[PDB]
Design an enzyme around this catalytic site. Structure first.
Site, short mmCIF file in Angstrom:
data_model
loop_
_atom_site.label_atom_id
_atom_site.label_comp_id
_atom_site.label_asym_id
_atom_site.label_seq_id
_atom_site.Cartn_x
_atom_site.Cartn_y
_atom_site.Cartn_z
N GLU A 198 2.72 -4.23 5.00
CA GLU A 198 1.51 -4.58 5.74
C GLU A 198 0.94 -3.39 6.51
O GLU A 198 -0.28 -3.14 6.49
CB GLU A 198 1.82 -5.72 6.71
CG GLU A 198 1.97 -7.06 6.05
CD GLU A 198 0.69 -7.61 5.48
OE1 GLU A 198 -0.41 -7.06 5.79
OE2 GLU A 198 0.84 -8.61 4.76
N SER A 230 -13.29 -10.91 10.79
CA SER A 230 -11.94 -10.90 11.33
C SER A 230 -11.29 -9.51 11.21
O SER A 230 -11.82 -8.69 10.45
CB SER A 230 -11.00 -11.87 10.65
OG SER A 230 -10.63 -11.49 9.33
#
Length: 129
Positions: A35, A50
Site C-alpha cells: 500500500e 477522496s
C-alpha cells in the site's frame, strides 16, 4: 517515517495485529509494503474527491474525516491527519475497525492483489519478535 520490515512487524505485534480476526502478522506487513512502501506519510489523492492516508492507505470516504470528501462516514472517528503520524497506533486502531465493520482484508486492494494466496510468512521471516 519509512519503516523497516522487521521493525514494522514488531510494532504491529505490540499493537495486537498477529492473528487479529484470523489474519497472521505477515498479512499486515505485506499489506503495508504494497500500500505505502512502509511510509507513514504516504498520501494518494483520488479523482473521486477522496484521499488515501498513511502506512495502510486508509480512505477518507468511509473511515476518517479530512473535511473535503463527499459522503464522509468517519467510521474510525478520527481526523485523517492522525493516520500520517510516525507512531502507527491510529492506523492500527482504524485497521482493526475496518475488519470489525464486516470487511476482511480484501478492503485493501494491494493485499487482495499482491498478498492473498502467497507465502506471507516470508514478510516476518528472520525478524526478532
Amino acid at each position: 517515517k519509512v519503516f523497516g520490515r522487521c521493525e514494522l512487524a514488531a510494532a504491529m505485534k505490540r499493537h495486537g495485529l498477529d492473528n487479529y480476526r484470523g489474519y497472521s502478522l505477515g498479512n499486515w506487513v505485506c499489506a503495508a509494503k504494497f500500500e505505502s512502501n512502509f511510509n507513514t506519510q504516504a498520501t494518494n489523492r483520488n479523482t473521486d474527491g477522496s484521499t488515501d492516508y498513511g502506512i495502510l492507505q486508509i480512505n477518507s470516504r468511509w473511515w476518517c474525516n479530512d473535511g473535503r470528501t463527499p459522503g464522509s462516514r468517519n467510521l474510525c472517528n478520527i481526523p485523517c491527519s492522525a493516520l500520517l503520524s510516525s507512531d502507527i497506533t491510529a492506523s492500527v486502531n482504524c485497521a482493526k475497525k475496518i475488519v470489525s465493520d464486516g470487511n476482511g482484508m480484501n478492503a485493501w486492494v494491494a493485499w487482495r492483489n499482491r498478498c492473498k494466496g502467497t507465502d506471507v510468512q516470508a514478510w516476518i521471516r528472520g525478524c526478532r519478535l
